[PDB]
């Protein structure tokens, strides 16, 4: 198990992609997995050990290209709409 990187996970037939972190949310004795809203599996307890995992969806957003008129110049800048700057280098 790895935690602080976006990963594919399969927990007892529950498949999804996201970043896994230690959950602040507290489960009742044998609830299996939470779904915060709209049946999205936002969390799961591990089957092998018994830790609780909080799941945040894979970071994503829209990319837009800032440019002056190509008539005037060719330099161009790019803006990533919804990401912290430290985690853009991946894509």
């Amino acid at each position: 198990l790895v935690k602080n990187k976006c990963v594919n996970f399969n927990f007892n037939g529950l498949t999804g992609t996201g970043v896994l972190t230690e959950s602040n949310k507290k489960f009742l004795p044998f609830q299996q997995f939470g779904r915060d809203i709209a049946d999205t599996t936002d969390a799961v307890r591990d089957p092998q050990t018994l830790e609780i995992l909080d799941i945040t969806p894979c970071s994503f957003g829209g990319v837009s290209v800032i440019t002056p008129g190509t008539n005037t110049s060719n330099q161009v800048a790019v803006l990533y709409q919804d990401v912290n700057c430290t985690e853009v280098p991946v894509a």
């Binding site: 809203i37 709209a38 999205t40 969806p57 957003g61 709409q81 919804d82």
Partner: peptide, 25 residues
């Protein structure tokens, strides 16, 4: 501002910021 009360994080959905922030309006 303090009277009026006012999207949750999800896939696909995204909310752009308004062009003029409240501080400049």
């Amino acid at each position: 501002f303090n009277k009026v009360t006012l999207a949750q994080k999800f896939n696909g959905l995204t909310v752009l910021p308004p062009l003029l922030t409240d501080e400049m309006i």
